[PDB]
Amino acid sequence: VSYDIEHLLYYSMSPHSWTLPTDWQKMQETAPSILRNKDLQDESQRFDGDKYLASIKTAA
């Protein structure tokens, strides 16, 4: 069960890769200082795997 960077970056574009972590409630209390992207309607600061994969391909 292995994945190259191409596969891993493709899966970042899944809707399931943007939902909050399952432990979000516990995380709000554990480490609130490290949390970001709290509004799911605002995808502006969401990681873009497509752009990241393209960036790698230019360095090659």
């Binding site: 069960v1 994945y3 960077i5 899966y11 899944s14 972590p21 200082s33 949390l35 970001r36």
Partner: protein, 179 residues
């Protein structure tokens, strides 16, 4: 919907160096995940290395392995150390992400030898380390070391320096391999 399962369960740890918490409580277990999508879900909702406080660490370890050289799964091991003195905020975050992808994707032949990775955020110099289970297993240490340089955006300037955890344990730090 079915997510893409990972070979291992991974745990994210955050160290703050915050006086509010006792020494033994400073290493905070954030959460664990076992799918690719659950990794991105975590990645998309936690601050990147370039946004976190000085003196802090992010550690990603296989489930039940703590980010401490003294843990029984780490005692006999070591680490591949990347020192980033003159690095941009973008390259630092990209290097940490590239390390995370190698780990969760199981990019090495000696998969079972990986323990986790740690990123230390310091103003003077940042460090990314990839911890391994057996410091004396040259074949694994070198195959991991080689895969890291070919997968990471690492030039000739910044070197990979493999250090035994029995060595870090004392007093610069002694290195047994340089790549």
């Amino acid at each position: 919907h079915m997510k893409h399962p990972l070979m291992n369960v991974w745990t994210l740890w955050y160290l703050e160096n915050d006086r509010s918490k006792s020494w033994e409580d400073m290493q905070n277990e954030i959460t664990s995940f076992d799918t690719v999508e659950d990794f991105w879900s975590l990645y998309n909702h936690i601050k990147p290395p370039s946004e976190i406080k000085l003196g802090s660490d992010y550690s990603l370890f296989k489930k039940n392995i703590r980010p401490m050289w003294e843990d029984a799964a780490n005692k006999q091991g070591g680490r591949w150390v990347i020192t980033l003195n003159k690095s941009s905020k973008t390259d630092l975050d990209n290097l940490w992400l590239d390390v995370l992808l190698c780990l969760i994707g199981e990019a090495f032949d000696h998969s079972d030898q990986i323990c986790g990775a740690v990123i230390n955020i310091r103003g003077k110099s940042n460090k990314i380390s990839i911890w391994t289970a057996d410091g004396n297993n040259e074949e694994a240490a070198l195959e991991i070391g080689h895969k890291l340089r070919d997968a990471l955006r690492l030039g000739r300037n910044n070197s990979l320096q493999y250090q035994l955890h029995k060595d870090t344990m004392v007093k610069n730090v002694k290195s047994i391999y340089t790549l």
